[PDB]
């Protein structure tokens, strides 16, 4: 069981992996991934 948090440290919209899944780290999430529409970086860890 893993939950979706918007990252608060990555800037702008999520294209790209790498960048949001690096700032959901940082912020100690276990991962991040973009969303489709409002292309946001969420990142998820578990819960």
Do not use: M, Q, V, Y
Request: proline share 9%; hydrophobic share 20%.
């Amino acid at each position: 069981r893993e939950c979706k948090t918007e990252s608060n440290t990555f800037p702008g919209i999520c294209i790209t992996k790498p960048p949001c899944r690096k700032a959901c780290i940082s912020e100690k999430f276990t991962d991040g991934h973009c969303s489709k529409i409002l292309r946001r970086c969420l990142c998820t860890k578990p819960c």
